[PDB]
Design a protein around this nucleic acid. Structure first.
Lengths: 82, 190, 129, 208, 84, 150
RNA sequence: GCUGCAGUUAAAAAGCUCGUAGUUGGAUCUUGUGGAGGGUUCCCCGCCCCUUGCCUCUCGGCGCCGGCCCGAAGCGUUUACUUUGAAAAAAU
């Protein structure tokens, strides 16, 4: 958040989950980032740069996460057709 | 002749006269006369597209519209070759009215028919462009900049016939209405 | 029955947004509902929407994000007079920095920030933020 | 996937899946477990697809790789069949096994001499190991597991469908899991057959 | 819902197995059929849920027995769509 | 829901999107008219007429092959009935109820049900009389029921 | 308790239904382009058919070269609504 002074106020900007486009708390203990490791996709070996996601605790605890992680990954690798 | 076989509406134009001439000539000829009848049109017009092609429009009186729609393909085929490389399509000449309030003056003489309103005409116009396929669905999409694109799902009866005409209808519709259209076919039909 | 069409529409989008759905089904379509959702789209609270056509009253399908929080109806439809406006705008909005009460005027349907710049009051329809 | 054939289905493994009866699946469905089933049989059996198994195996495995230190991807199983399997798993790839009765409060406590604090979990059968799953959402652990066709999905980020009512279906699936992680992280990859047997990942079973 | 729903486009035929007015675009599920039973060579056309006895003017003159559902045929012959 | 029963149901007919179907139809507009006129002679009424056309002929509806409907076709002749069939069928019914009540006077159930059907006449009438499809002097009575049924 | 209350058990829904007044009531009958004011399309003249709907004219000005053109005169089916004016004693 930016004032007319140009002072960039607010203690931190909180992360916004890709599960359902909404923002998690600071004591929500069911909200998990999950790092998937990319591979070269020519031999099948680790290659550097991870794809990281984040999911909110609310959709997790009702049990929607299995579809959400699949849908996110389906538009990338290592699922492209299921 | 050729300048007096189409009633008022763009009476002296070279191409338009040459269309009417060979049109009525064929209808009197005995080559086919079981789907052709001597009648008059009511106008004609030639309008291009950005596809690098021209297309002719033939209007009709509209109660006579039923007979023109009968042959419509054989006839159009002959005129595709006679005016080479141009598509030819029939349409119906439909009047459209201002609101009964507050532009043109009236004494509320009539009710403003709902078969002479604006919306009823633009629906009827769409039926003529893709006449040999008929229309199974319509859907519409709205864009983030307030534009609208009107998808039209057409029957797969006579699919190929209008699928080599599929772009040229869109440039036609733009000029006649003002509206944007696209076409598609499904794989599912009643 | 369904005496208020607009009132039945918005409750759906409210319920749906809470669960996290990003496609919905709203019926019946009305022209009033179209221009409503147009305003809600421009500002960027919802995405593009598709009007299925029938020959009855239509049905609408919407693409939405988690940005929406609450859109309400106000029944009955009160008048506003551009000094009554401020009294309203306090009550329906959580802030002075965001949210838009919507209304209809003789200059067409629009948000309140826009209506004040046309200098015309009118009848209030709903709100959102 | 998108790799040429080195991250795609192999002719060999299809035979192993079908010999161990993984394709067969229980007589019930959920509203989340109907996107991996194709259809039902003449019989009450519901037939899991193996194409759908294969993709889910991979991105599951790629996440298990992604930790820098593998010594804290804590595997858990309490049913008898998945005991012998997990022990060889956590010997092969660096992990910490928890066999048998969980003893709850493992990650919640601060004072307990069996305290653990992993990052991931890989659980067999959600509805036998419900205690660690519930406890996962108090310490922000991602979760992976093997679902039947009717196990409840809730605190399961990614599933890896299986038959898992016992037999060879259990041990085979843990063996395949350990094959993949070594191809990707290690240098065991050669795309020519691994020495280790799926035989010694199966259940001990009452002996002769 | 899994929150992956597609309502823009219908399902292959799982949309076409629901109640007829809960389909995206309404349709009947009834149809006609062009029937020609032995001995009266004419193309009769009959509705599937006829509700009434249908006659033929030849030797045959009975073709349906009314039922609440699809009417029973007196002789099991002839089914067409026809066309649309 | 039902106006004097608690039930809430569905059985409403659903028409197709396309109305030029099924595109093989024998007979055309003028032909349909004479086909209709014959039926009204025989004692059929507009609802029955459309059934007997639809079931055994290529017509789906007369709405979809002419600009008219079954009632308007009869009206152009002047062969239309003097009051709606709808109104008639209510009045036709209520006389039989009154007969059963005279034959059996301990049937309180019947007495109740008559009040429902009775009120349903008056409500229906209050549509018609404002639309000038009846005389504005017309009123429902015991006496008028007797005369209109026989 | 209109804004802004409550009615399973804390005070509390007529035994039940019908019914006139009252209150409330589905969908449906128009969008794009040059100039001008503000962006990069979009919100005072006009254009596709419409554009402050029409005429009919005649009396009293403006024109241009007897002849011709356009402001004022009836109004757009009616209300509410909204916006502007007029109009309002002082003290408070």
């Amino acid at each position: 958040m930016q004032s007319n002074a140009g002072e960039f106020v607010d203690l931190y900007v909180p992360r916004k989950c890709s599960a359902s486009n909404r923002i998690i708390g600071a004591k929500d203990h069911a909200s998990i980032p999950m790092n998937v490791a990319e591979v070269d996709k020519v031999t099948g070996r680790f290659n550097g740069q991870s794809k990281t996601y984040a999911i909110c605790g609310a959709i997790r605890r009702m049990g929607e996460s299995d579809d959400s992680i699949l849908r996110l990954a389906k538009s990338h690798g290592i699922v492209s057709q299921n | 002749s050729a300048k007096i076989v189409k009633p008022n509406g763009e009476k002296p134009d070279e191409f338009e006269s040459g269309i009417s001439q060979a049109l009525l000539e064929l209808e009197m000829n005995s080559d086919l006369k079981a789907q052709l009848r001597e009648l008059n049109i009511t106008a004609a017009k030639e309008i291009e597209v950005g596809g690098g092609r021209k297309a002719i429009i033939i209007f009709v009186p509209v109660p006579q519209l039923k007979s023109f729609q009968k042959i419509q393909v054989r006839l159009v085929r002959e005129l595709e070759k006679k005016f080479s490389g141009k598509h030819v399509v029939f349409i119906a000449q439909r009047r459209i009215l201002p609101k009964p309030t507050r532009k043109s003056r009236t004494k509320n003489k009539q009710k403003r028919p709902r078969s002479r309103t604006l919306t009823a005409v633009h629906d009827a116009i769409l039926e003529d462009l893709v006449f040999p396929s008929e229309i199974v669905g319509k859907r519409i999409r709205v864009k983030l900049d307030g534009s609208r694109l009107i998808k039209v799902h057409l029957d797969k009866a006579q699919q190929n016939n209008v699928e080599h005409k599929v772009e040229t209808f869109s440039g036609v519709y733009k000029k006649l209405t003002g509206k944007d259209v696209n076409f598609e076919f499904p794989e599912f039909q009643l | 029955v369904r005496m208020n069409v607009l009132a039945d529409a918005l409750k759906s989008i409210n319920n749906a947004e809470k669960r996290g759905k990003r496609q919905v089904l709203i019926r019946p379509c009305s022209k009033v509902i179209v221009r409503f959702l147009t305003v809600m789209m421009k500002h960027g609270y919802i995405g593009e929407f598709e009007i299925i056509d029938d020959h009855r009253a239509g049905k609408i399908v919407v693409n939405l994000t988690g940005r929406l929080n609450k859109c309400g109806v106000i029944s009955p439809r009160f008048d506003v007079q551009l000094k009554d406006l401020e009294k309203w705008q306090n009550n329906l909005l959580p802030s002075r920095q965001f949210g838009f009460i919507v209304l209809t005027t003789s200059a067409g349907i629009m948000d309140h920030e826009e209506a004040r710049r046309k200098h015309t009051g009118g009848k209030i329809l709903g709100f959102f933020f | 996937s998108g790799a040429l054939d080195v991250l795609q289905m192999k002719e060999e493994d299809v035979l192993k899946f079908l010999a161990a009866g993984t394709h067969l699946g229980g007589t019930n469905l959920d509203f989340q477990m109907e996107q991996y089933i194709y259809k039902r049989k003449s019989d009450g059996i519901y037939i899991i697809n193996l194409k759908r198994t294969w993709e889910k195996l991979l991105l599951a495995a790629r996440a298990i790789v992604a930790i820098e230190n593998p010594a804290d991807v804590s595997v858990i199983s309490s049913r008898n069949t998945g005991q012998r399997a997990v022990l060889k798993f956590a010997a092969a790839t660096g992990a910490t096994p928890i066999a048998g009765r969980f003893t709850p409060g493992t990650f919640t406590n601060q004072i307990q001499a069996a305290f653990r604090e992993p990052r991931l979990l890989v659980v067999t059968d959600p509805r036998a190991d419900h205690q660690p799953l519930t406890e996962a959402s108090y310490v922000n652990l991602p979760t992976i597991a093997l679902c039947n066709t009717d196990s409840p999905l809730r605190y399961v980020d990614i599933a890896i469908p299986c038959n898992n009512k016992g037999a060879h279906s259990v041990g085979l699936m843990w063996w395949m899991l350990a094959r993949e992680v070594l191809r990707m992280r290690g240098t065991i990859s050669r795309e020519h057959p691994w020495e280790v047997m799926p035989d010694l990942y199966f259940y001990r079973d009452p002996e002769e | 819902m899994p929150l992956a729903k597609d309502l823009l486009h219908p399902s292959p035929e799982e949309e076409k197995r629901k109640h007829k007015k809960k389909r995206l675009v309404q349709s009947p599920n009834s149809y006609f059929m062009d029937v020609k039973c032995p001995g009266c060579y004419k193309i009769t056309t009959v509705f599937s849920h006829a509700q009434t006895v249908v006659l033929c003017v030849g030797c045959s003159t009975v073709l349906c027995q009314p039922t609440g559902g699809k009417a029973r045929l007196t002789e099991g012959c002839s089914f067409r769509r026809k066309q649309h | 829901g039902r106006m004097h029963a608690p039930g809430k149901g569905l059985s409403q007919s659903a028409l197709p999107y396309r109305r030029s179907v099924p595109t093989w139809l024998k007979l055309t507009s003028d032909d349909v008219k004479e086909q209709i006129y014959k039926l009204a002679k025989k004692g059929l009424t507009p609802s029955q007429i459309g059934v007997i056309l639809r079931d055994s002929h290529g017509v789906a509806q007369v709405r979809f092959v002419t600009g008219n409907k079954i009632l308007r076709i009869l009206k152009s002749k002047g062969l239309a009935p003097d009051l709606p069939e709808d109104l008639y069928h209510l009045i036709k019914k209520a006389v039989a109820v009154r007969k059963h009540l005279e034959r059996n006077r301990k049937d309180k159930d019947a007495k109740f049900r008559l009040i429902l059907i009775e009120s349903r006449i008056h409500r229906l009438a209050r549509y018609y009389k404002t639309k000038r499809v009846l005389p504005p002097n017309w009123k429902y009575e015991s006496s008028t029921a007797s005369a209109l049924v026989a």
